[PDB]
Amino acid sequence: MNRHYLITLTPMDWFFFGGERTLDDGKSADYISHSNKFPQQSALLGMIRYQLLKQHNLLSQFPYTENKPTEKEIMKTLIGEQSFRMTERKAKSLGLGVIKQISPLMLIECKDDTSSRSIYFPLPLDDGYKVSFNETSNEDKVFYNGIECPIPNVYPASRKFFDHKTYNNYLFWCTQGNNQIKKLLSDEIWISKMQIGITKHVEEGEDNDKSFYKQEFLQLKKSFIYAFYITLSGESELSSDIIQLGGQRSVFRMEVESIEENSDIQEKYQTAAQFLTQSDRLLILSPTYVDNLKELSALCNFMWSDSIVFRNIQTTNASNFYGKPIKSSSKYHFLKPGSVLYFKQGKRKEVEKLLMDYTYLRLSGYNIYI
RNA sequence: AUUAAGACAUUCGUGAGUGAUUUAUUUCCAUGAAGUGGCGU
């Protein structure tokens, strides 16, 4: 039937998950490139597809080449005809091969024990404060670009009011304790180094395009690994290997573990995130892509949200795999993890319906909440 | 096939130029070539 795996990635060296105004972008190519802390789920999909072809010896080698029909059909049945695409955001099927669903990438801490792994999540933006939202006729009201919404009274749940100077919840990641949420600073998880690189020969070149590039390489602290859950169609197999995930040939180690069958991985991820639940808000655990933010703000009053940029590399089975890849023509803005959507009385169901209507994005571990 | 791939912080560069171990300082101070006669009553 279907087969469920847990896939742990261990950084062998300093990795580089980059992208936005990255190098070789032109328009002041901006040699200084900073690494994103996580890869896009598209990178996860592509890595899975690349390794699936590696196991079956179906990769493209040598300069521009061709394909015979039967290997084309086996690539169809294994990986799919087309990469992760934003245009298929409302397709009810993943449009790929044996891959059905992947959980959002999760940060996992591996203590030196048989003891289980602690799952670390970004700290909710509302953690530490209470939002009361007093609404009995006009007593206070705010317009967000021309929409009526209640007033967000925010107090430190410890009265005073929200001092943005004290606000440091965006710098923390959380995990479950006995009954205390364990807060970890982002620096205690990711260490960064700036690298200076040049081309030695020196030929005719112009700045941002000849030499002298600086890249941010991230290292993940000792006992921390990246993980996700995958469902495969059952006629394939995933083998432990050494992978390339990210930019500048960032090399990782796959440990593929088979979890017991009949296990919906979405329920597993939500069980992991259960300790952050609050009855009055929806916690965004992974980037979300509501097609109308004004529509969402209609039913949510205070959206304690941030934004991340998403851009995808678009390739098919027959594409120049050695060349400037085709990037997604549109830049897609996603809701940062840890974002808080505060809804009206009731009305939770149709905002959840708006969030889950992107079933293709739900399957690629994006619009996940708790 | 993954906002990817490719790229030595490198090429040129003398720890060198100018600059007396020189200036000041009596081998000097004290000091008798001196002392005494002897016998032959």
Distance of A206 CA from B41 C1′ (whole Å): 145
Which residues, 6+ apart, have CB-to-CB distance to A153 below 8 Å?
A131, A132, A133, A134, A161
CA gap A5, A269 in Å, rounded? 13
DSSP SS3 for A316: strand
Q: The tokens of A188 are what?
A: 């205690």
CA gap A78, A73 in Å, rounded? 9
Contact call for residues A7 and A230 (beta carbons, < 8 A): yes
Nucleotide nearest to A212 (CA to C1'): B9
**DSSP assigned state of A325:** -
- Only one residue has tokens 């020196």, namely A202
Which residues, 6+ apart, have CB-to-CB distance to A211 below 8 Å?
A197, A198, A199, A202, A205
For A41, half-sphere exposure in the C-beta direction (CA atoms, 13 angstrom radius) is: 27
Which residues, 6+ apart, have CB-to-CB distance to A219 below 8 Å?
A11, A14, A15, A190, A191, A192, A193
Distance of A88 CA from B33 C1′ (whole Å): 140
Phi/psi at A49 (5° precision): -65, -40
CA gap A32, A192 in Å, rounded? 14
DSSP SS3 for A306: coil
Q: Report the candidate in A291, A332, A288 with the shortest Cα–Cα distance to residue A310.
A: A332
Contact call for residues A241 and A48 (beta carbons, < 8 A): no
CA gap A32, A11 in Å, rounded? 23
Contact call for residues A244 and A44 (beta carbons, < 8 A): no
DSSP SS3 for A266: helix
Q: The tokens of A105 are what?
A: 């990438």
Query: Alpha helix (H) ranges present in A148-189?
Result: none
CA gap A208, A3 in Å, rounded? 47
Contact call for residues A118 and A108 (beta carbons, < 8 A): yes
Nucleotide nearest to A50 (CA to C1'): B1
Distance of A139 CA from B38 C1′ (whole Å): 159
For A3, half-sphere exposure in the C-beta direction (CA atoms, 13 angstrom radius) is: 13
Which residues, 6+ apart, have CB-to-CB distance to A4 below 8 Å?
A229, A230, A231, A232, A258, A259, A261, A263, A265
Distance of A20 CA from B36 C1′ (whole Å): 131
The experimental technique behind this entry is cryo-EM
Nucleotide nearest to A243 (CA to C1'): B2
Contact call for residues A102 and A41 (beta carbons, < 8 A): yes
CA gap A48, A79 in Å, rounded? 9
Contact call for residues A90 and A357 (beta carbons, < 8 A): yes
Distance of A196 CA from B8 C1′ (whole Å): 11
Distance of A370 CA from B29 C1′ (whole Å): 114
Distance of A17 CA from B16 C1′ (whole Å): 49
Q: How far is residue A62 CA from its own chain's centroid?
A: 33
Which residues, 6+ apart, have CB-to-CB distance to A130 below 8 Å?
A154, A155, A157
Nucleotide nearest to A17 (CA to C1'): B3
Query: Alpha helix (H) ranges present in chain A?
Result: 41-55, 69-78, 265-273, 293-299, 348-356, 359-363
Contact call for residues A279 and A81 (beta carbons, < 8 A): no
CA gap A230, A219 in Å, rounded? 25
- Max distance between CA atoms of chain A, in angstroms, equals 73
Which residues, 6+ apart, have CB-to-CB distance to A66 below 8 Å?
none
Q: The tokens of A326 are what?
A: 């085709």
Q: The tokens of A145 are what?
A: 């670009």
Instruction: Tell me the torsion sign for CA atoms A190, A192, A198, A200.
Output: negative
CA distances to A121, A230, A351 from A355, in Å = 20, 21, 6
CA gap A122, A93 in Å, rounded? 29
CA gap A274, A109 in Å, rounded? 18
CA gap A305, A180 in Å, rounded? 24
Contact call for residues A285 and A337 (beta carbons, < 8 A): yes
Q: Report the candidate in A56, A49, A104, A80 with the shortest Cα–Cα distance to residue A273.
A: A104
Nucleotide nearest to A46 (CA to C1'): B2
**DSSP assigned state of A288:** B
Nucleotide nearest to A20 (CA to C1'): B3
List all nucleotides in chain B with at least one atom under 7 A from a protein Cβ.
Answer: 1-10
Contact call for residues A215 and A193 (beta carbons, < 8 A): no
Residues in chain A, overall count: 370
Q: Give the angle subtended at the CA of A4 by the CAs of A313 and A226, to the nearest 5°.
A: 55
DSSP SS3 for A121: strand
Contact call for residues A29 and A246 (beta carbons, < 8 A): no
